[PDB]
From a paper:
UspC from Mtb is a 441-amino acid protein that has been previously identified in bioinformatics analyses as a putative active importer of carbohydrates across the inner-membrane of the Mtb cell wall. The uspC gene forms part of a putative three-gene operon, uspABC, of which uspA and uspB encode the membrane-spanning subunits of the transporter, while uspC is a homologue of ABC transporter-linked solute-binding proteins. The fold of UspCNt follows the architecture of periplasmic binding proteins for bacterial ABC transporters, consisting of two subdomains or lobes that enclose the putative carbohydrate-binding cleft in the centre of the molecule. In conclusion, our data strongly indicate that Mtb-UspC is a carbohydrate-binding unit of the essential UspABC transporter system, with a substrate preference for sugars containing an amino group at the C2 or C3 position.
UspCNt crystallized in two different crystal lattices. An initial model of UspC was generated using ARP/wARP, extended manually (COOT) and used to determine a molecular replacement solution for the monoclinic crystal form (PHASER). An improved experimental density map could be generated by multi-crystal averaging (DMMULTI), which allowed to build and refine (REFMAC5, PHENIX.REFINE) a complete structural model. Comparison of molecule B of the monoclinic crystal form of UspCNt with the tetragonal structure demonstrates that UspC possesses the capacity to undergo a similar closing motion.
Author numbering: 39 to 438
The structure:
Amino acid sequence: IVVTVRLWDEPIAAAYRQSFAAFTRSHPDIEVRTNLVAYSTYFETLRTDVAGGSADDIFWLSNAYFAAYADSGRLMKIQTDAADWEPAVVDQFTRSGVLWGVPQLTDAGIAVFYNADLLAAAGVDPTQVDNLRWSRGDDDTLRPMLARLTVDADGRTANTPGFDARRVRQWGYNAANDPQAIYLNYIGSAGGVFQRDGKFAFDNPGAIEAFRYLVGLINDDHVAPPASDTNDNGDFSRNQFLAGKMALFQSGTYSLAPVARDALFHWGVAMLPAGPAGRVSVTNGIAAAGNSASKHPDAVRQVLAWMGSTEGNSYLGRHGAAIPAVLSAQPVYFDYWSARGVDVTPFFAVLNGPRIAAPGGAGFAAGQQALEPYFDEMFLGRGDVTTTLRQAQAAANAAT
């Protein structure tokens, strides 16, 4: 009996092959085969295959797309215990009171890389960075911390008279037109939404609050790089962090590999700052769904059970590049990194409260491209956040 597993990441396909070889040794009635399809056309192809009965037994879904499949009965109900799976990914795949996929991988949450040498030089202990709060009111603690951490070529900090924003040598932070690392967390941390019911919905009080704050950090405080540096250069801030030029660099686990490889100074990871509604990180996960039209539904059930076990899911995290969604399997990931001198807890701890889903779905790419020029102007400090969001929303939706 052959069960086929469909997915889109190659290194993970390698890890699956190692996982399923271990499965078949304890369950030799079943051979599992992986089937790579490139990310760029995965969903358009899965849509055709599912629709006409030739999709694989097991396939990867994201949050963006599973809904259409779940409603039309394409997907098996995941009828197991869920206490050992990331709650974030579990919620991501629950619809009408049913779990529709076995959680496989998670992004985890956003955190704050810091350059400890640059903290030491400014008189800041790394623990201080874990208790920061952003706000439009006078309960804010982020801004003065970023100000202390932003230095011009004369040694004048951002809050000092004389400070020259043209001559900044060291930025405190990476506030920028950068959804995943920055503004999606600000919106959620303000109680706003970015997307609702497959439509862009960021024209709302919370998002207004978030964008005013960010606009201010960049154009008025000068504690993050100018928007011309970062609008359409997604890597600018990370490169400045690597060059020893940025105190705090707010990002996800995707920057762990690029940071560990090249960073020559002492560094760590601290918590996401809290907003008016707490520390709310963007997150996103991947689940493996069972095909309801599978020729061998029992064997699929055995394979899904293994994929969701400590032992099976451990394989995806053993290389420290993808994070297991099984909670008991995640120490393979922590260990990978602790041995390389990095504590990864803040990326995980942040999930322990409320969250915002990574936006996605049909017509999203096109919508995201359409809002882009308006967001660029907004981060350039031009016009008004209010008027910009209203026009950007109408434009994003039209394109969708």
